[model samples]
Target: GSSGSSGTDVSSWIVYPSGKVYVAAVRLERVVLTCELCRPWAEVRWTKDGEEVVESPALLLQKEDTVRRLVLPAVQLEDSGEYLCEIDDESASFTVTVTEPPVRIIYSGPSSG
Candidate 1:
């Protein structure tokens, strides 16, 4: 998930938007989760809603040196749920809540833009 190579094997746990664990996003917005296990030799599995993620056209998975990502190009309401990252028995949870994008356009007469 980065360019630096020196610390590729560094022992650390990474989650984007670092301070928050519970993520809230709007519909059709991008939602991305990045993780790097302390155990570099192991692979992390991405699970959603009680099943392993099946990458669709909008949802994608990317793996880098010691890091992996669950990238959502456009998060729909159905996509919002509990997502898990695990390696063996060690795991972490991500709670994503997606809300409807509403009232984007103000009330106007015959608006075309």
Candidate 2:
């Protein structure tokens, strides 16, 4: 018989990644999914929108000691989704909005003009 219920002594804490429901990132630019897990290094997986994140040149996944990040070299319209960064049961979610970069500054001129 054990005294009281055996509770897991080790507890984990995840921070940094706000896990905002609606996150926006400019298309054709670097976008990042970041999270911080304290306690121990745990296995992490990224599922986007409604599917798993397959290997691609645009994606860069980093598994640092405290911070974990999934970087997109050039955020495209397809990249926008509900990105779920999961660590076992605990997970982080973000609804990424891929918007066109601000339209400003300059444009190619017509020769006739």
Candidate 3:
């Protein structure tokens, strides 16, 4: 049976309060998860390494009515993983990376040298 809700690919613009993305390896403390439109109200849960972490009292849930979000406090390296945003029997999953200074790599120095 279905929940009469289809899986929606939620594309959100996550940003920091400083108005810029977090850097690399400096600890990502928070993020603003926003969706494009408002959807049905559903329970949001946070999971790490395939285990649901409901025991964490620090977890916070925010409703934009515009962009529902699972606001996490003290986001660490362990928080980085496949995060599932569940709603109305349907779920939308996303990946979270905790780091500061933003690490970007550029491969140089040729192939077949």
Candidate 4:
């Protein structure tokens, strides 16, 4: 939270938790979490499945002003879980559910005798 200077009044901002996201297996899922009312130098933290979030080939994180985004490329069944984002003492959490992708079937003519 930020406080206004004595000479000016600062607008108030509140941090609201985001909703869940559904992803298909082997697809990409982008999660956007926001933390308003944060100070300019506020620190942000992200965690998935009770473990801290880190950058990897499949996981990517980006921060745009007050919004934080998590990109899960090539999502898998194991990637489905709860994700948490925090700023200062305020926190936001959401769940990700990964389901099976569409199946494709290939057919060929019967083999000649």
Candidate 5:
């Protein structure tokens, strides 16, 4: 299926079954999964890793127009996975990575190497 950009980077101008989206969970509290449909009959659902994402304090789903969005709040290590966005027979996949936040910073002077 052909899809347009939604939130993150576009892997390719065209579309495919799987699209990898890499995001820092600590930096960005949430990530959006956008699905484009040809008809209004399409539905959007989400799965984290392998388990279905149901109604919870951290998971929220909404639909606007012909697009369905999956919102994940307060992302955690358990949230990382192949987040699948399914609509009818077409499904879009994203590999979400939740990594540890950086601990230290390094700065150098103009004379330092």
Candidate 6:
């Protein structure tokens, strides 16, 4: 039912709070998901393009006080999605984009657009 709230289609995908909708088509290497809870016993699940990636050695989990974090490695284009964490039926989500690193060039003239 929760997923249905957003209209159940890629067209229904809303912009994540981070503001950028999609990456500029590049090799995505990694993404991180983090959360904070007012108390203990919160649930955090990391999903990529609509699939859940379970805890693995490549996945990094960091805990600090009441906050928790999950780091993904070797991310690719398929890693794009609305990453949501459900805590007792209430959830929070974040979006991440990985774009091609811009090529740098030396400036030889006056900088004017």
Number of backbone collisions per candidate, in order?
A: 0, 0, 8, 0, 0, 2
lDDT assessment of candidate 6: 0.51
Candidate 4 backbone collisions, by pair: none
lDDT of 3 by residue, 10-112 (tens): 5432221213223222254666554333444433444556666574545566666445666666567766656655433444556567655566667787578
Q: Write the per-residue lDDT of candidate 5 for residues 1-113, one digit (tens) a residue.
A: 57543443333321433355554465336777665655454455666665667887777777767556677766777777677765444456677777767865787678856
> Model 4: what TM-score?
0.63
- Residue 33 local lDDT, model 5: 63
lDDT of 1 by residue, 1-113 (tens): 54333434433344332433688888888877767655555566777766888878888887777767677787888888888775555457788899999778766687679
TM-score comparison, 1 vs 6, better candidate: 1
Looking at model 3, report the run of 10 residues with the lowest lDDT sum: 13-22
TM-score of each: 0.70, 0.71, 0.48, 0.63, 0.62, 0.52
Best-fitting candidate, scored by TM-score = 2
Q: By lDDT, is 1 or 5 better?
A: 1
Ten contiguous residues minimizing lDDT sum, candidate 6: 6-15
Clashing pairs in 5: none
lDDT of 5: 0.61
Q: Candidate 3: how large is its RMSD?
A: 12.9
List ranges where model 5 is wrong by over 4 Å: 1-21, 103-113
Our model 5 lands, by Cα RMSD against the true structure, at 11.0
RMSD each, Å: 7.6, 6.9, 12.9, 6.3, 11.0, 11.4
Q: Could you tell me which residue pairs clash in candidate 2?
A: none
